[PDB]
Amino acid sequence: KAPVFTVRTQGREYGEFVLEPLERGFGVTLGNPLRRILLSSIPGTAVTSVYIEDVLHEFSTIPGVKEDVVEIILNLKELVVRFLNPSLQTVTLLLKAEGPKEVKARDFLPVADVEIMNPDLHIATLEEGGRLNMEVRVDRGVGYVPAERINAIPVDAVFSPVRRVAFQVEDTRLGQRTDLDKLTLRIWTDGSVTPLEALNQAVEILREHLTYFSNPQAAAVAAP
Amino acid sequence: LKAPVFTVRTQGREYGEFVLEPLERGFGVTLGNPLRRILLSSIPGTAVTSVYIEDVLHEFSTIPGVKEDVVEIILNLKELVVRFLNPSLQTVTLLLKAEGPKEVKARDFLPVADVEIMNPDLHIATLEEGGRLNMEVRVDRGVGYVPAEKHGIKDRINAIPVDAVFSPVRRVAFQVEDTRLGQRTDLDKLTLRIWTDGSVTPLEALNQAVEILREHLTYFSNPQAA
Amino acid sequence: DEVWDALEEVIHGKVVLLNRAPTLHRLGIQAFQPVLVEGQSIQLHPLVCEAF
Amino acid sequence: ERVVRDSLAALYAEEDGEVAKVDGNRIVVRYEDGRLVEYPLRRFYRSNQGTALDQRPRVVVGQRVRKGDLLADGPASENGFLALGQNVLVAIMPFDGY
Amino acid sequence: YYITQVRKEKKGAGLEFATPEEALAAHERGEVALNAPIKVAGRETSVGRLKYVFANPDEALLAVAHGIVDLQDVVTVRYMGKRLETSPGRILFARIVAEAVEDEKVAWELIQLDVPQEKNSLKDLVYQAFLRLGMEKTARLLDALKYYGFTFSTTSG
Amino acid sequence: EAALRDLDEEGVVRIGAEVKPGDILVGRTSFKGESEPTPEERLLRSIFGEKARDVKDTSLRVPPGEGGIVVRTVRLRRGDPGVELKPGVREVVRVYVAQKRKLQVGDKLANRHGNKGVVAKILPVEDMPHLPDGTPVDVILNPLGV
Amino acid sequence: FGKRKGEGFGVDKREVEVLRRAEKLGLVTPGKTPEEQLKELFLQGKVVLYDGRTGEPIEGPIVVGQMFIMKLYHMVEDKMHARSTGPYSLITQQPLG
Amino acid sequence: AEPGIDKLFGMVDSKYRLTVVVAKRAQQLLRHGFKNTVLEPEERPKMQTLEGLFDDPNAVTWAMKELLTGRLVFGENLVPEDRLQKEMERLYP
Secondary structure, eight states: OOOEEEEEEETTTEEEEEEEEEOTTHHHHHHHHHHHHHHHTSEEEEEEEEEESSOSSTTOOOTTBSSOHHHHHHHHTTOOEEESSTTOOEEEEEEOOOSSSEEEGGGSOOOTTEEESOTTOEEEEBOTTOOOOEEEEEEEEESEEOOOOOSEEEOOEEOOSEEEEEEEEEEEEETTEEEEEEEEEEEEEOSSSOHHHHHHHHHHHHHHHHGGGSSEEEEOOOOO | OOOOEEEEEEETTTEEEEEEEEEOTTHHHHHHHHHHHHHHHHOOEEEEEEEEETTOOSTTOBOTTBSSBHHHHHHHHTTOOEEESSTTOOEEEEEEEEESSOEEEGGGSOOBTTEEESOTTOEEEEBOTTOEEEEEEEEEEEOSEEOGGGOOSOSSSSOEEOOEEOOOEEEEEEEEEEEOSSSOOOEEEEEEEEEEOSSSOHHHHHHHHHHHHHHHHGGGSSOOBO | OOHHHHHHHHTTTOOEEEEOSSOOSGGGEEEEOOOOOSSSSOOOOSGGGTTO | OHHHHHTTOSEEOSSSEEEEEEOSSEEEEEETTOOEEEEEOOOSEEOTTSOEEOOEEOOOTTOEEOTTOEEEEOTTEETTEEOOEEEEEEEESOOTTO | OTTTOOOOOGGGTTOEESSHHHHHHHHHHTOSOSSOOOEETTEEOOHHHHHOEESSHHHHHHHHHTTSSOSSSOOEEEOSSOEEOOOHHHHHHHHHHHHHHTOHHHHHHHOOTTSOOOHHHHHHHHHHHHHHSOHHHHHHHHHHHHHHHHHHHHHOO | OTTTTTBOTTSBBOTTOEEOTTOEEEOOEEEOGGGOOOHHHHHHHHHTTOOOOSEEEOOEEOOTTOOEEEEEEEEEETTSTTOOOSTTOOEEEEEEEEOOOOOOTTOEEEOTTSOEEEOOOOOOGGGSOBOTTSOBOSEEEOGGGO | OHHHHHTTOOOOHHHHHHHHHHHHHTSSOTTSOHHHHHHHHHHTTEEOOBOTTTSSBOSSOEEEEEEEEEEOSOOHHHHOOOOSSOOBOSSSOOBOO | OOTTHHHHHHTSSSHHHHHHHHHHHHHHHHHTTTTTOOOOTTTSOEEEOSSOEEEOOOHHHHHHHHHHHTOSOOOTTSSOHHHHHHHHHHHOO
């Protein structure tokens, strides 16, 4: 009696996936590993560094720019970048615009096979006389990497395109058995990778990792 | 470019240690735990499903010349581990005839083809002079814990249904230790330690557990509209 | 095993009263909709334990 | 120990001796005086409250008993010590509101 | 309570500094504890308050998931156009109430974010939820608080 | 005969039989309503070929929620040696049934220090908290009780 | 913990995490080896427990040990009752057992 | 719980009014076998069976769900009783 797997989706940002019925205990058995994978192992892009021309360090402030360096960094951590080319590793985007104009993420100079999923993302509000010149470093990686040239500032990088994963395993009954399992799995992503895609990738990572048990190399058992 | 080394250490059919390293940080748990779950629960096996004893009408009786009460007897047979060599064999009824001042063990069961008792020195009953013990012990294949109260139609009228714990797996532990590619100090060395009853090999158990997990991961393949 | 599927239909939408003695104030009797369960015990929500 | 002793739920060795016969329903012993005595065991007996009062023999055939030694455990006694329950592995923690 | 409560570490010993980077250095050397009262530049601020800045609540939570920091440790988080000094656990509780009542702003009005949640504060939250929002919504909030409370109380240790 | 299969000649149930609620422990018949059948019943008895009889079924069955494996039986009659009972009663039967109760949800456990409680959940061994050597704990006690 | 080393095993990364939180809580003296820290915890009667569902450790140590527990004559089997209809009293005409 | 209970409370000057109304309406739906419902087929309260979605057997759930739509009219002395009964029996036998 193979279980049904149901999918409910709103946009590319969010989805619910329900697997029922499962045998007793299996809701968690599937639920936990997938979640662990979904939060870390799923590949994506993140800003790992930022350099400002007039800024000596993260805690400084920029004349003619309302928001401090740290706030701008916070606006950079929400930047969603997609690499269309599988060979691409590191890409450096440049933004020079100093005008008294509202600045969005759309203003970054376009690069081949690099797509901005959120062009309307706000960075800073510049006024008359204000000047902003920046080079941001975008890299490919997995999970969350803390910040830990010369004036280039290290940035906490969120690689995981999956923003949040939460699962609930609830009791269910098929005929006689009242102890069966219903596994509900909710996934919030940034739109770079659809929830369904992230789920599939996680499952695949797990399977491939189960393949590693295939080729035994013996060793002796120790005794005192 | 690095595929994790899978190492195996084994002592007899009862216990084994199974290593996989290096793994990505956190994967020692990610792989380790759900296997342990499936091992302790879903691995098929064999256990005594029934007991007949001549001139014994029910579990609460007491046999003349025998020290043990029928309840202690079935409590003992609960500990009997039986290994089926032929995968097509779902049931065996062992026979044990005995008398005289004898201390009966599992070895005393009349031998059956492709059916091996992994603990023949297991104590069953202590008989004295005048004591006579004639048993038919039905052993079946199964999975998990099936209580006696769930029994169907029994073989005989004096048949005593016995609680059946099928899982061959006695214990599963796992250790996750830090390991190095030498640049990366944070990697995961996973080690699954498995004790079983001898009916099934720790490697066999581990393998079919991994298979259960894979076959479950399969279930995510065919979505439905909601 | 078809009967329980019918009982599930009987109690659908219905509620039962649970009461614990002594009934000191009115909340010592409350109405819940029953969820059929295996076992001989009544399962009670933790939050209502205080009132009861 | 002394609780089970004085409650006389269990059988003890009346005199130094050796045990001839042992099974579920009886224990027969011979003492130094050559006294042959058969102690019948009460088995699966319904008490007022419905609990089963059941004597389980702790001694095998051809064993040396000393006066004060336990022949058969009474109900709820393990080796002549009061057994009112089981010893189990407890973890003291909250678990999911159960 | 266990998840909304914040840590006080005495190893910092209230040492005042000038540059935040000095404080980070001293922290990395193993001198000053992660959460300690510390005066850097103009005002008093925690070490981890400077070290970790989060653009998202679920970024902070994602970090916690990776074992970067705990829910009790105190960090800097941007929530609803406001820079907050609250711990990940209080952010979590905030989202718990918010998702439960399905009104984020009103939930932000109901909660007391700067205190560890306990009997009376939770009681007050419930009453205020009964007033400001529906009766049934309040019931849902109750069930949510039950679930998460139990959940955390299990793994709290 | 489905209902009668476990009864011996006298009507008493057989020793060692497994009886659930509703199964007859002892058969008995007693004269119904002064030998007066209701006229509406009298015709339907004839439709089915004279099921009409002097006696009705007073037999002792197994009360709901009860039952187990039959262990002992004791039958005593008037007009037999050594046996005499209260005035008016011809005979008396006793069925001693045994059941071995495993621990279940709702049963009361207690330590000697006064901590008492009922089992509200039985967890599968994989769900249990365990030591690093893999051994699972038997019981989880709430610290708030201390 | 002693035979752990004899069998070729060290301390879990999870045990490290638990020990970090434990010295944060003040149950173990900072700077000492995990080998010894766990001994300190064990001396308090607390160990490191793993949650069987998640495979992750319970944050902070947990008291475990052998406790003697009794099963009591009160039993749910004897205590459950239900009625739709049944006998009524002769005189009072109220439901009767 | 139950959907829109606060609104049902809002529809009346006393809770017990709502109770009386819902109860009586349930009696109406039962006696006439639910054909007199003011609910459209897609608005019909459904129950999940092994076979599939079927009409919810519960009359009170129905009465409440109808009342929430505001299509029902309630109050004291709307009509005389017997006339109402005969009219309802004429419309829905």
